[PDB]
Amino acid sequence: HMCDAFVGTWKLVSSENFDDYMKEVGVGFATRKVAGMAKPNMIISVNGDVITIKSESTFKNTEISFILGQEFDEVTADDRKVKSTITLDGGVLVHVQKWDGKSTTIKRKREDDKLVVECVMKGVTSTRVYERA
Numbered sequence: 441h442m443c444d445a446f447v448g449t450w451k452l453v454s455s456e457n458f459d460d461y462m463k464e465v466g467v468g469f470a471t472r473k474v475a476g477m478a479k480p481n482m483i484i485s486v487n488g489d490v491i492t493i494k495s496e497s498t499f500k501n502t503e504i505s506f507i508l509g510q511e512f513d514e515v516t517a518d519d520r521k522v523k524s525t526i527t528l529d530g531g532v533l534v535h536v537q538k539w540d541g542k543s544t545t546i547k548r549k550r551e552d553d554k555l556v557v558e559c560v561m562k563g564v565t566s567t568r569v570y571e572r573a
Protein backbone atom coordinates (compact mmCIF):
# COMPACT_ATOMS: atom_id res chain seq x y z
CA HIS A 441 0.00 0.00 0.00
CA MET A 442 3.28 2.09 -0.16
CA CYS A 443 2.37 4.26 -3.08
CA ASP A 444 -1.38 3.85 -3.17
CA ALA A 445 -2.26 7.50 -3.55
CA PHE A 446 0.11 7.82 -6.58
CA VAL A 447 -1.40 4.91 -8.50
CA GLY A 448 -3.51 5.80 -11.50
CA THR A 449 -3.58 7.68 -14.77
CA TRP A 450 -2.65 11.31 -14.70
CA LYS A 451 -2.57 14.12 -17.29
CA LEU A 452 -0.32 17.22 -17.32
CA VAL A 453 -2.33 20.40 -16.71
CA SER A 454 0.24 23.10 -15.98
CA SER A 455 3.95 23.75 -16.11
CA GLU A 456 6.18 26.51 -14.83
CA ASN A 457 9.82 27.22 -15.64
CA PHE A 458 10.26 23.92 -17.49
CA ASP A 459 12.19 25.45 -20.44
CA ASP A 460 14.74 26.86 -17.94
CA TYR A 461 14.97 23.45 -16.21
CA MET A 462 15.65 21.77 -19.56
CA LYS A 463 18.30 24.41 -20.43
CA GLU A 464 20.00 23.81 -17.09
CA VAL A 465 19.97 20.02 -17.74
CA GLY A 466 21.59 20.67 -21.16
CA VAL A 467 18.71 19.84 -23.49
CA GLY A 468 19.19 21.32 -26.96
CA PHE A 469 16.97 23.83 -28.66
CA ALA A 470 14.84 21.60 -30.91
CA THR A 471 14.20 19.04 -28.16
CA ARG A 472 13.27 21.77 -25.72
CA LYS A 473 10.73 23.24 -28.13
CA VAL A 474 9.06 19.94 -29.06
CA ALA A 475 9.25 18.34 -25.66
CA GLY A 476 7.97 21.46 -24.01
CA MET A 477 4.73 21.30 -26.05
CA ALA A 478 3.93 17.79 -24.85
CA LYS A 479 1.05 17.11 -22.44
CA PRO A 480 2.01 13.63 -21.24
CA ASN A 481 -0.26 11.00 -19.72
CA MET A 482 1.64 9.50 -16.70
CA ILE A 483 0.50 6.01 -15.61
CA ILE A 484 1.69 4.79 -12.24
CA SER A 485 1.19 1.20 -11.09
CA VAL A 486 2.48 -1.14 -8.42
CA ASN A 487 2.82 -4.95 -8.49
CA GLY A 488 4.36 -6.30 -5.32
CA ASP A 489 7.54 -4.31 -4.71
CA VAL A 490 7.86 -3.18 -8.32
CA ILE A 491 6.66 0.32 -9.22
CA THR A 492 6.13 1.20 -12.89
CA ILE A 493 5.88 4.77 -14.17
CA LYS A 494 5.01 5.23 -17.84
CA SER A 495 4.63 8.50 -19.68
CA GLU A 496 2.88 8.62 -23.06
CA SER A 497 2.89 11.64 -25.32
CA THR A 498 3.01 12.79 -28.94
CA PHE A 499 6.72 13.30 -28.62
CA LYS A 500 7.95 10.21 -26.81
CA ASN A 501 6.88 7.38 -24.62
CA THR A 502 8.96 6.52 -21.56
CA GLU A 503 8.76 3.66 -19.04
CA ILE A 504 10.61 2.79 -15.92
CA SER A 505 10.12 -0.10 -13.47
CA PHE A 506 12.00 -0.13 -10.19
CA ILE A 507 12.23 -1.14 -6.56
CA LEU A 508 12.60 1.65 -4.04
CA GLY A 509 16.24 2.31 -3.10
CA GLN A 510 17.63 0.09 -5.89
CA GLU A 511 19.57 1.86 -8.68
CA PHE A 512 18.61 1.24 -12.30
CA ASP A 513 19.37 2.39 -15.86
CA GLU A 514 16.90 4.91 -17.40
CA VAL A 515 16.59 6.53 -20.83
CA THR A 516 14.97 9.96 -20.35
CA ALA A 517 12.48 11.74 -22.65
CA ASP A 518 15.45 13.85 -23.97
CA ASP A 519 17.50 10.71 -24.57
CA ARG A 520 20.01 10.96 -21.70
CA LYS A 521 21.31 7.59 -20.43
CA VAL A 522 21.20 8.00 -16.65
CA LYS A 523 21.61 6.00 -13.48
CA SER A 524 18.51 6.51 -11.33
CA THR A 525 17.47 5.78 -7.77
CA ILE A 526 13.96 6.39 -6.45
CA THR A 527 13.12 6.45 -2.77
CA LEU A 528 10.16 7.46 -0.59
CA ASP A 529 11.00 10.32 1.86
CA GLY A 530 8.12 11.20 4.06
CA GLY A 531 5.50 10.31 1.50
CA VAL A 532 7.37 12.08 -1.40
CA LEU A 533 8.80 10.00 -4.19
CA VAL A 534 12.40 11.29 -4.71
CA HIS A 535 13.99 10.41 -8.08
CA VAL A 536 17.71 11.17 -8.55
CA GLN A 537 19.29 10.87 -12.01
CA LYS A 538 23.06 10.83 -12.44
CA TRP A 539 24.93 11.15 -15.77
CA ASP A 540 28.19 12.66 -17.02
CA GLY A 541 29.05 13.84 -13.51
CA LYS A 542 25.75 15.78 -13.29
CA SER A 543 22.66 15.19 -11.13
CA THR A 544 19.01 16.19 -11.20
CA THR A 545 16.22 15.45 -8.72
CA ILE A 546 12.54 14.99 -9.50
CA LYS A 547 10.12 14.97 -6.53
CA ARG A 548 6.52 13.71 -6.87
CA LYS A 549 3.91 14.44 -4.20
CA ARG A 550 0.17 14.22 -3.78
CA GLU A 551 -1.35 17.58 -2.94
CA ASP A 552 -5.17 17.76 -2.79
CA ASP A 553 -6.42 15.95 -5.93
CA LYS A 554 -3.19 16.71 -7.87
CA LEU A 555 0.11 15.04 -8.35
CA VAL A 556 2.78 17.75 -8.23
CA VAL A 557 6.17 17.12 -9.91
CA GLU A 558 9.12 19.33 -8.97
CA CYS A 559 12.20 19.07 -11.16
CA VAL A 560 15.45 20.61 -9.85
CA MET A 561 18.78 21.09 -11.70
CA LYS A 562 21.26 23.16 -9.62
CA GLY A 563 19.53 26.50 -8.80
CA VAL A 564 16.60 25.96 -11.24
CA THR A 565 13.28 24.51 -10.17
CA SER A 566 10.27 23.71 -12.30
CA THR A 567 6.82 22.65 -11.21
CA ARG A 568 4.56 20.41 -13.27
CA VAL A 569 0.98 19.73 -12.07
CA TYR A 570 -0.91 16.58 -13.04
CA GLU A 571 -4.62 15.81 -12.49
CA ARG A 572 -6.46 12.49 -12.76
CA ALA A 573 -7.16 11.60 -16.33
Ligand SMILES: O=C(O)CS[C@@H]1Cc2cc(Cl)ccc2Sc2ccccc21
Nearest residue numbers: 475478480495496497500501517518568
Ligand atom coordinates in the same frame (compact mmCIF):
# COMPACT_ATOMS: atom_id res chain seq x y z
O1 LIG B 1 7.19 14.29 -15.81
C1 LIG B 1 7.28 15.52 -16.08
O2 LIG B 1 6.34 16.18 -16.52
C2 LIG B 1 8.64 16.19 -16.09
S1 LIG B 1 10.01 15.20 -16.75
C3 LIG B 1 9.69 15.20 -18.52
C4 LIG B 1 8.73 14.21 -19.01
C5 LIG B 1 8.27 14.15 -20.43
C6 LIG B 1 7.65 12.94 -20.77
C7 LIG B 1 7.15 12.75 -22.07
CL1 LIG B 1 6.39 11.27 -22.42
C8 LIG B 1 7.22 13.77 -23.00
C9 LIG B 1 7.86 14.94 -22.70
C10 LIG B 1 8.38 15.15 -21.41
S2 LIG B 1 9.12 16.71 -21.14
C11 LIG B 1 10.73 16.26 -20.56
C12 LIG B 1 11.82 16.67 -21.28
C13 LIG B 1 13.07 16.43 -20.80
C14 LIG B 1 13.23 15.71 -19.61
C15 LIG B 1 12.14 15.27 -18.93
C16 LIG B 1 10.87 15.54 -19.37
